[PDB]
Design a protein around this ligand. Structure first.
Ligand SMILES: O=c1ncn(Cc2c(F)cc(F)cc2F)c2ccc(Oc3cccc(-c4nc5ncccc5o4)c3C(F)(F)F)cc12
Ligand SMILES: [Mg+2]
Ligand SMILES: [Mg+2]
Length: 560
């Protein structure tokens, strides 16, 4: 069937939308080529629509069937619980989109009876109506990027009302947080912290006689997802021991929301129909990871690829296997892609086989190596700084709900670019406005957390280890990439950053306390007379477990 059907009404904005980067006195310290930075607007929706709209083609075979059964067998072991309305309400973010029934995020978290009552209403309805298609809203997502030798058309977000959203949680939150793990095991990409991820890639890599890996990029994965896939996906959820209420809710949500439904623009007009995965629902992450793993695993048997391990993060997939020879690999890879095409997961960019782990890119990230205080090789997760930086610049000029910079510093703490640019820049600014104390929000795996800037040392040490503060002698490849990017966006030279860092470091050490701890560890790279960095007390006792459990992009999740 057609992934989408349009009535003609436009994808409309609910407020004015900024697209250019504001010439701000602060952002300018970061990068000078500000016209290279942009934000997507509904003004490009049409372009994105033409791409995400097409007729899916799917042919399932015995391999596909075999893997599904293997997957169902494992899910059979799961027993998912039903969340109460309070638990579900506590999971709602404060910024989350208000309901069209007289209540907003804040009311939900406060358990305001007007809200909680309508919520119960939607739930009762999910227990009685097993057919009626639930309304969704379509919007153009506003994200920051850096131009390219053109521009990226906005991405479309389809999401149900806050009411239906607190319910999805009530019936599927426990499921999407545990099932993927039970089914895919070591392959479930969201259970890892960046370091546990690198360790997993490296370990998997070194376990092959002659390794070979490749990343597979599906063309607009979300729309490749068919009704069949969605039902199959639910068939798995159904293997869980579930309270009657939840089993019904899942059955209904599957037929009324997940498999497809009507579309409405911000102006309340009928835009069309969706017969594929909605980005803004709770099951997107889990659903896509399971679906991708299913097809990919089944595809490897089809393409005769030998002993292949996989790491899946939603629509993002990377695969490592035993090389059978240069030409044979290129053969099987193509054989793979076709299998996936039949499964309705054609590639955006044809996949190319890699024989060096540093060249494989998954989750926009690659694995690279540097050295610690003692000169020991250290492996860490990195990526291209372009978008991170561009967004960092934008988040400097405008007040913004989520701070991609904070999250990026956390996830990429050991990288050269995060430590030299981001850490310096933001502390330099925070320190100024005396904001070092204020807590900020950011997202890790789509989930939303509230982080205190002054706890970055503990956090970083816990998730990465002390070496995150002393890595040096990065790879020439990471060095080249970083440089090119920094040069492209007009970022100040290394020296300007070393100076700026030496400065903020001093201003931090004087403040004493956590501030001193920040200056001491975070900026140890700037001073000639390095200090001895010892394990930070607070780090010793931190529960960063909930941080790396599952994915929740578009899931409307907030962990307090
Ligand atoms: O391997 C290293 N080992 C240690 N240090 C020191 C160091 C560090 F251990 C951590 C940190 F947090 C900052 C920092 F200093 C390096 C510092 C810079 C570098 O790479 C270079 C070298 C020369 C120029 C540029 C360079 N080209 C540029 N072009 C435009 C703007 C800025 C630029 O900087 C770069 C860089 F873009 F950083 F990758 C490599 C290393
Ligand atoms: Mg974990
Ligand atoms: Mg895609």
């Amino acid at each position: 069937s057609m992934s989408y059907t349009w009535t003609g009404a436009l994808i409309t904005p609910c407020a004015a939308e900024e697209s250019k980067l504001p010439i701000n006195p602060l952002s300018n310290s970061l990068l000078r080529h500000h016209n290279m930075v942009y934000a997507t607007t509904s003004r490009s929706a049409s372009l994105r629509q033409k791409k995400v709209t097409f007729d899916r083609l799917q042919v399932l075979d015995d391999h596909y069937r075999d893997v599904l059964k293997e997957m169902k067998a494992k899910a059979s072991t799961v027993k998912a619980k039903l969340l109460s309305i309070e638990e579900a309400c506590k999971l709602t973010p404060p910024h989350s989109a208000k309901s069209k029934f007289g209540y907003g995020a804040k009311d939900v978290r406060n358990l305001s009876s007007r809200a909680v009552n309508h919520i119960r209403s939607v739930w009762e309805d999910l227990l009685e109506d097993t057919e009626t298609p639930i309304d969704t809203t379509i919007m153009a997502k506003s994200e920051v990027f850096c131009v390219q030798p053109g521009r990226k058309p906005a991405r479309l977000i389809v999401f149900p009302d806050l009411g239906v959203r607190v319910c999805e949680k009530m019936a599927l939150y426990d499921v999407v947080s545990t099932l993927p793990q039970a089914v895919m095991g070591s392959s479930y990409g969201f259970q890892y912290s960046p370091k546990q991820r690198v360790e997993f890639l490296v370990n998997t890599w070194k376990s092959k006689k002659c390794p070979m890996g490749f990343s597979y990029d599906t063309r607009c994965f979300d729309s490749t997802v068919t009704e069949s896939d969605i039902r199959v996906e639910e068939s798995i959820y159904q293997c869980c021991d579930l309270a009657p209420e939840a089993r019904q809710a899942i059955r209904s949500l599957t037929e009324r929301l997940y498999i497809g439904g009507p579309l409405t623009n911000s102006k309340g007009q009928n835009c069309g129909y969706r017969r594929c995965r909605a980005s803004g629902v709770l099951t997107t992450s889990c659903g896509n990871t399971l679906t991708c793993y299913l097809k990919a695993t089944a595809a490897c048997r089809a393409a005769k690829l030998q002993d292949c391990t996989m790491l899946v993060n939603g629509d993002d997939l990377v695969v490592i296997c035993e090389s059978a020879g240069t030409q044979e690999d290129a053969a099987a890879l193509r054989a793979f892609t076709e299998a996936m095409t039949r499964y309705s997961a054609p590639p955006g960019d044809p996949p190319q086989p890699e024989y060096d782990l540093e060249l494989i890119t998954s989750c926009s990230s690659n694995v690279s190596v540097a050295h610690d205080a003692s000169g020991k090789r250290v492996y860490y997760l990195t990526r291209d700084p372009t978008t991170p930086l561009a967004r960092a610049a934008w988040e400097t000029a405008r007040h913004t709900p989520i701070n991609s910079w904070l999250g990026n510093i956390i996830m990429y703490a050991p990288t050269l670019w995060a430590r030299m640019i981001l850490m310096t820049h933001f502390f330099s600014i925070l320190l100024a406005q005396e904001q070092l104390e204020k807590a900020l929000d950011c997202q890790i795996y789509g989930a939303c957390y509230s982080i205190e800037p002054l706890d970055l040392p503990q956090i970083i040490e816990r998730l990465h280890g002390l070496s995150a503060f002393t890595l040096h002698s990065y790879s020439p490849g990471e060095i080249n990439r970083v440089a090119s990017c920094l040069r492209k966006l007009g970022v100040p030279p290394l020296r300007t950053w070393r100076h700026r860092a030496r400065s903020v470091r001093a201003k931090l050490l004087s403040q004493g306390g956590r501030a001193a701890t920040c200056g001491r560890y975070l900026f140890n790279w700037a001073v000639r007379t390095k200090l001895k960095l010892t394990p930070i007390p607070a780090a010793s006792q931190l529960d960063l477990s909930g941080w790396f459990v599952a994915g929740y992009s578009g899931g409307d999740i907030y962990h307090s």
